[PDB]
RNA sequence: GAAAUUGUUGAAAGGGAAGGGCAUUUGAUCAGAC
RNA sequence: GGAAUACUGCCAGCUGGGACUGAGGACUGCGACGUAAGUCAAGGAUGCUGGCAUAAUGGUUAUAUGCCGCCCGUCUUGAAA
RNA sequence: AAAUAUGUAAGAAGUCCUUGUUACUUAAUUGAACGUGGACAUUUGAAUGAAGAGCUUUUAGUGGGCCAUUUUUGGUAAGCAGAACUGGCGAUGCGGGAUGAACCGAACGUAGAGUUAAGGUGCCGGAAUACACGCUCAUCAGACACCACAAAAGGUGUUAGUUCAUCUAGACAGCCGGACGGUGGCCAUGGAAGUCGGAAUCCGCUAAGGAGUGUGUAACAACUCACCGGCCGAAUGAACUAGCCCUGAAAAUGGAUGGCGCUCAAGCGUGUUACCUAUACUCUACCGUCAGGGUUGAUAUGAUGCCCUGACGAGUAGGCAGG
RNA sequence: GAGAACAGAAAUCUCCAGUAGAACAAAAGGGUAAAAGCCCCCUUGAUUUUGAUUUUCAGUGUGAAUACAAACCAUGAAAGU
RNA sequence: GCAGUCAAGCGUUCAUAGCGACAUUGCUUUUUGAUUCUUCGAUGUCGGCUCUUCCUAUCAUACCGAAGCAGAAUUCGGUAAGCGUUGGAUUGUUCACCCACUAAUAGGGAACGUGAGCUGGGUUUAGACCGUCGUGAGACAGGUUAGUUUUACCCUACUGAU
């Protein structure tokens, strides 16, 4: 969907000989809070011996972008399950928001490797601060001084089902 | 068909024991590479420049945690010097600086799950060779921070 | 052809599977006969005593 | 050849003794006292061949109706077709034991009577039904030395 | 003096079957009533 | 540092347009507004107006058009066969 | 030693106090069973539900079954021979899968209005030739579960990644120059000098150069390559992973993503909205059935009448009722 | 296993180890160590009268089995069986 | 098929738990082209006549590629179904096998096309004989003989005609 970003802070259940258990925090990209807390318990059950009925959610908050109108370059580390095995990938996305870069990455994985949502882990999202630290040429070709390009062959949609002159694709 | 059901049982057993040996080997690799700070503060018979004073109260263990964090700064410095001008850096450089900063954030919160160094945990650590069940019986793995330990 | 237990639980649950009724004062046949005889004599004595004292 | 439906058929693991529990039986089996109305479980002993129950009644629970010299009569409900029939088994006391839940319930009855009498002598009415488990109530979770530690998913085989 | 079946006259339909259901157009025909 | 606007939620806030229906048949109930007789959108539609008064609406009947529609009875787990 | 499935209990036919009976039992004034008298209801002993509960008599049809997921036994194996649990078809229409006993949705009195399920929205055909990011060009593309089957392997087709290397001390490609000396190393040969063969595989000078990678001569020569240098000036090479495409074998009347047709799609992967329509859901009317109720006055009727309220309605074999 | 004339796989005697690896009529499964096995002593309960219960089950019959009652006996110092 | 050596992927990063593609040797001699008069054949419900289409897995004819291909004649491949593919002999029959001629005598499908288009034999009995078995009546898919199905004027399809 159109994703949001949440921090989820959870904890075990306090008991005898373990009072005040340690708190653990995650950042989940999800479209609502129910899916956010479900993904939290998925990852915490894979990393520790805690169940959803063994622990409790302490806090759920939504994180906005600090500067939503500033074009940034993001490096994303992911791992995924193909039909044969599982692999790690690194990719680069030039966009204005982390949730926007995550949406474009999910569309790119579906288009290029036929990987669905249930078989993708976002390991890390980070911003690449300097140029000459950009590895991908498809991102590098937009970081050139005084960038200009045209848009040939403009196609315009219409109504009325009939036209009375031949169209023109000039621009 | 010349397979029946006995071929299917055979291929099921072989594929299962293959997959299970793979996942078991992967879990032991994850545990060995998780329990590396323990082997670091274990090594040289608990830092054999100080193999006589068996106390390590509250500033020595902080120094040892910091040394375990910055143990790999020589490769990072060498990679900064060998990093060419018109080139993006290497994946080793990016992942090693990632390890660096993700350890330093954990240092700023609560340093490292290390030994307690306030009980017989030092004796159990010196007599704790390589098994994963020192945590199961006698760990005392209380953590500290980059300040007053708590 | 030979044997099947298909439909039989559905047939059994049509009119329900019922527990039998249980009464106060069960039947004393099948209980030990010495106890049975002495219980008869004790019951007759209690009836006589209640008819005597209890008006 | 043909099928067989003898009295102890398909009972190979059911009537054997446990590990290192062979030989004679202890005397608290023989020293226990049963009464008409007691609730008993049936667990057969393979070393005592007289007064042995059928394999259907292994693990069943019933009520005592009769006490004899070395035996006890028990009532069991058995499902036959679309109804239950009551069955009367006369077993030796080496194949039975008391049910513990009856003891817990009688202790609950005594504690209920004591609580009601003490509440009446105190001047108040207290509720004696058990309740199921309830949802939790609100709390504060302080972070004094318990700052939250950020977790992330792990790669495939890099740190392995 | 029924039906099957047939003749004549009138009306209609018909580019490899006919018949049926729901709905309305067209033509013919018809009761109630204000 | 001071705001605004998104997003989500609430109102026993107001207001315009369209469609289907009008069961019941003296009074009785619960209310609302008014100081009160009264009034009301409160236990189910009334008010005003026009045309036509016969094949006009409607029925029957013969067709046409749109969509759908395999031959009945019988035995069989299974019938258009 | 799981999971799933399984027995019992969660009280008034109960608990406590006191003392009556007996021919049973105790050494006994002990017990056992059944009682008299007294005390204990705002919760009488966990949850949720309860279309009334309990009981009796009598009689019909049936006693050929089959299909699906999962777990299984015998036969290389079958739409082969057999079992276990649940759901269905038989006995059943309706919307969808073009078509179909069994799949998906949903079960049916007669109608009106609204909303939907599963499936769809280029035209046939009601409904966006919607919006968004990519991938693919097939000289039998591909197009939606059951269901109308095909990988490893090969591709100098394209897309995205992973790990190794080289590079302004100048990488890759191209042009040009060097490519030396013991030595025509040792056997075999009519002759084979790096290049028909067996042995071999060293040394010097080097910036580098093989007791030789090929072409070549009867044998020599000559050329090339391996390896160094000059010129030109920016990134390049290998192995591997997996997306779509081509090949991965097809049989005989003319034919089938349902058809036409479609190529920045009307194909494939993914996302967000709008819209279409079932005998299903909601509201209203009418019919019938079942249940719960009201109604004494005769002058006016049918007390079998009149009336109020609520719920429900599939059906073969078969039963009963009203006409 | 260690010892003893003939004695030599193996004849009889002595000691130590020995949870059953032996035996218990027959198939297989279960059970059993101061015993259910081996050796001795005494016996006839493998008797009489009839009800109740479990398995197969229609909760019919047949077969087999279980627990009491009323007699008469066996064995044992006895409880008991 | 059995046995052994390998060695890229492997046991979703382990080589030697345990697989294991491509290879590679062994084993099957009247082992110096020797013997082998042999069709060691298969086939029991089909075979033959007549006639028409379709497939390509191509025998010939057309055009190409490779080969120590001098010429001539062949061999191995690619495209290709436009066009052809016979006359006899013979065992129950057919295939296979022979004799020729030939450019060549390719391979298949259409209810193993054409068992109520036609025919030999069967389905398909009743008469009789031999062999074997049975006390016998009888039996045998062991052998040999003789032996009854018999539309079209209907609708469509097709060929011609109003
Ligand atoms: Mg049957
Ligand atoms: Mg059924
Ligand atoms: Mg016995
Ligand atoms: Mg007539
Ligand atoms: Mg009205
Ligand atoms: Mg009319
Ligand atoms: Mg009209
Ligand atoms: Mg009309
Ligand atoms: Mg139709
Ligand atoms: Mg029929
Ligand atoms: Mg009382
Ligand atoms: Mg019957
Ligand atoms: Mg029948
Ligand atoms: Mg039937
Ligand atoms: Mg049914
Ligand atoms: Mg149905
Ligand atoms: Mg349908
Ligand atoms: Mg279909
Ligand atoms: Mg309706
Ligand atoms: Mg349309
Ligand atoms: Mg379409
Ligand atoms: Mg799509
Ligand atoms: Mg709408
Ligand atoms: Mg209904
Ligand atoms: Mg009905
Ligand atoms: Mg009927
Ligand atoms: Mg019996
Ligand atoms: Mg060809
Ligand atoms: Mg031709
Ligand atoms: Mg010829
Ligand atoms: Mg013929
Ligand atoms: Mg014919
Ligand atoms: Mg004959
Ligand atoms: Mg004749």
UniProtKB/Swiss-Prot annotation, chain A:
GO terms for biological process: cytoplasmic translation. There is a cross-link at residues 124, 130, 148 (Glycyl lysine isopeptide (Lys-Gly) (interchain with G-Cter in ubiquitin)). Keywords: Cytoplasm, Isopeptide bond, Phosphoprotein, Ribonucleoprotein, Ribosomal protein, Ubl conjugation. It comes from the Eukaryota. GO terms for molecular function: structural constituent of ribosome. Pfam families: Ribosomal_L18A. The modification Phosphoserine is found at residue 31. SUPFAM superfamilies: RplX-like (SSF160374). The keyword 4Fe-4S does not apply. Component of the ribosome, a large ribonucleoprotein complex responsible for the synthesis of proteins in the cell. The small ribosomal subunit (SSU) binds messenger RNAs (mRNAs) and translates the encoded message by selecting cognate aminoacyl-transfer RNA (tRNA) molecules. The large subunit (LSU) contains the ribosomal catalytic site termed the peptidyl transferase center (PTC), which catalyzes the formation of peptide bonds, thereby polymerizing the amino acids delivered by tRNAs into a polypeptide chain. Present with 54300 molecules/cell in log phase SD medium. There are 2 genes for eL20 in yeast. Belongs to the eukaryotic ribosomal protein eL20 family. This is Large ribosomal subunit protein eL20A. It comes from Saccharomyces cerevisiae (strain ATCC 204508 / S288c). The gene is RPL20A.
From Swiss-Prot, chain B:
It comes from the Eukaryota. It is found in: Nucleus. Keywords: Nucleus. The keyword Nucleus applies. One of its GO terms (cellular component) is nucleus. Disulfide bonds: none annotated. Present with 5350 molecules/cell in log phase SD medium. Belongs to the TMA16 family. This is Translation machinery-associated protein 16. It comes from Saccharomyces cerevisiae (strain ATCC 204508 / S288c). The chain holds residues 24 to 173 of 178 of the full protein.
Swiss-Prot record, chain C:
GO terms for biological process: cytoplasmic translation. There is a cross-link at residue 48 (Glycyl lysine isopeptide (Lys-Gly) (interchain with G-Cter in ubiquitin)). Residues 1-33 are annotated as: Disordered. One of its GO terms (cellular component) is cytoplasm. GO terms for molecular function: structural constituent of ribosome. Keywords: Cytoplasm, Isopeptide bond, Ribonucleoprotein, Ribosomal protein, Ubl conjugation. Belongs to the eukaryotic ribosomal protein eL29 family. Component of the large ribosomal subunit (LSU). Mature yeast ribosomes consist of a small (40S) and a large (60S) subunit. The 40S small subunit contains 1 molecule of ribosomal RNA (18S rRNA) and 33 different proteins (encoded by 57 genes). The large 60S subunit contains 3 rRNA molecules (25S, 5.8S and 5S rRNA) and 46 different proteins (encoded by 81 genes). Present with 51100 molecules/cell in log phase SD medium. PANTHER family: 60S RIBOSOMAL PROTEIN L29. This is Large ribosomal subunit protein eL29. The gene is RPL29.
Swiss-Prot record, chain D:
Disulfide bonds: none annotated. It is found in: Cytoplasm. Gene3D superfamilies: 6.10.250.3260, Ribosomal protein L21 (2.30.30.70). Keywords: Cytoplasm, Isopeptide bond, Ribonucleoprotein, Ribosomal protein, Ubl conjugation. SUPFAM superfamilies: Translation proteins SH3-like domain. Component of the ribosome, a large ribonucleoprotein complex responsible for the synthesis of proteins in the cell. The small ribosomal subunit (SSU) binds messenger RNAs (mRNAs) and translates the encoded message by selecting cognate aminoacyl-transfer RNA (tRNA) molecules. The large subunit (LSU) contains the ribosomal catalytic site termed the peptidyl transferase center (PTC), which catalyzes the formation of peptide bonds, thereby polymerizing the amino acids delivered by tRNAs into a polypeptide chain. There are 2 genes for eL21 in yeast. This is Large ribosomal subunit protein eL21A. It comes from Saccharomyces cerevisiae (strain ATCC 204508 / S288c) (Baker's yeast). The gene is RPL21A.
